[PDB]
Paper text:
Major antigens on the iRBC surface include members of the [name] erythrocyte membrane protein-1 ([name]) family, highly polymorphic and modular proteins composed of DBL (Duffy binding-like) and [name] (cysteine-rich interdomain region) domains. Adherence of iRBCs to uninfected RBC (known as rosetting) and adherence to the microvasculature (known as sequestration) are thought to be primary causes of morbidity, especially in cerebral and placental malaria. iRBCs adhere due to the binding of [name] to a variety of endothelial receptors among which are CD36, intercellular adhesion molecule-1 (ICAM-1), and chondroitin sulfate A (CSA). Further analysis of recombinant portions of the MC [name] molecule identified a 179-residue polypeptide, [name] (residues 576 to 754), as a minimal portion of the MC CIDR1α domain that retained binding to CD36. We present the structure and analysis of [name] in the context of the broad sequence diversity of the [name] domains of the [name] genomes and indicate the insights into overall DBL and [name] structure that [name] provides.
[name] is composed of a bundle of three helices connected by loops and three additional helices. The first helix (H1) of the bundle is joined to the second helix (H2) through a disordered fourteen-residue loop. At the end of the H2 helix there are seventy residues in three smaller helices, a, b, and c, that form the connection to the third helix (H3). The “V-shape” of [name] is made up of the three-helix bundle and the three helices between the H2 and H3 helices, in the order H1-H2-a-b-c-H3. The H2 and H3 helices also make many contacts with each other and are linked by a conserved disulfide bond, Cys 49-Cys 159, that is observed in the electron density. We directly observed four of the seven cysteines and have evidence that six of the seven cysteines in [name] are in disulfide bonds. We reasoned that one cysteine had reacted with cystamine (the oxidized form of cysteamine) during protein refolding, which implied that there was one free cysteine in [name]. From comparisons with DBL domains, we concluded that Cys 51 is the single unpaired cysteine in [name] (see below). The three-helix bundle of [name] structurally matched each DBL C-terminal three-helix bundle, a region that has also been named “subdomain 3”. In the [name] crystal, pairs of molecules interact and bury 4300 Å2 of solvent accessible surface area between them.
Residue numbers in the entry:
A (entry chain A), B (entry chain A): 2 to 29, 44 to 167
Write the structure that this text describes.
Amino acid sequence: DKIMSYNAFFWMWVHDMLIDSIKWRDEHGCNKKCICFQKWVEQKKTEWGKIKDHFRKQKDIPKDWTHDDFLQTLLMKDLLLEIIQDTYGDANEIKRIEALLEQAGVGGIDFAALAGLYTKGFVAEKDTTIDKLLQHEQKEADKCLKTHTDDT
Amino acid sequence: DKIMSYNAFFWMWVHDMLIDSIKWRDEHGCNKKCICFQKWVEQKKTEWGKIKDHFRKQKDIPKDWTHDDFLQTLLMKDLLLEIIQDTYGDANEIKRIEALLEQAGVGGIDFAALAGLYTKGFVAEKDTTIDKLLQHEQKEADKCLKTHTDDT
Ligand SMILES: [Cl-]
Ligand SMILES: [Cl-]
């Protein structure tokens, strides 16, 4: 059953994944908890592998054309504006520049619109932020079960 | 005479350009001023055209290889993190997630490092944020000289 689009789902899963990870750090009898947390890291590892398999498989489609090019155009505009904003000025300056550009008929920064670039290209990558966090999660789970022995 | 690298210069010029534009809006006898401002828009138009000519010419170099690929890797990481940060949570959440990623050995968002992607690809674009602002500047200059007639 396909409930929603994989693009919409991907971002939901990634976000949910991150806030769940943060919630686990707060949680950390300190053995039953770490066994539940290991199980969860394993679960997320499995789902993530499937996410990757899915996007890796959906790379054979030729389709869209102008959309891929439109995303490049947006990426250029966003990179220019973002880089300037992140390396120059204070809040007042950043605001005045946004206004200047809006008054000139130039949309402000909008990275969300570039989402397709990530889901299309992360599969060509060797490692990924999520893969890295999952490994870190695993190493966290391991160090916890080694230190905290409660299961009698 | 080449004083500095074109990449470093480009970003300086773009930024300087933007804050000069803002300073002009504040400025706006309202004829001598608009003639100085037109002249300036013409000047910047000329410099920008030369900037484009330069980067358009410097597109024949095969060189770097891994650097181009490294930028793609960074673009993926930055897009993931940025998009999540821009579509989810409050300040506290965004901060906790940054910490989570840092504690997991994942650098935070850094678009400045992707500067090469803009200077390499903006030349393939039909229109550009700067081109758009310059046109807007010109139209501003024009509407000012039409309304404010002082030169007797
Ligand atoms: Cl642009
Ligand atoms: Cl990534």
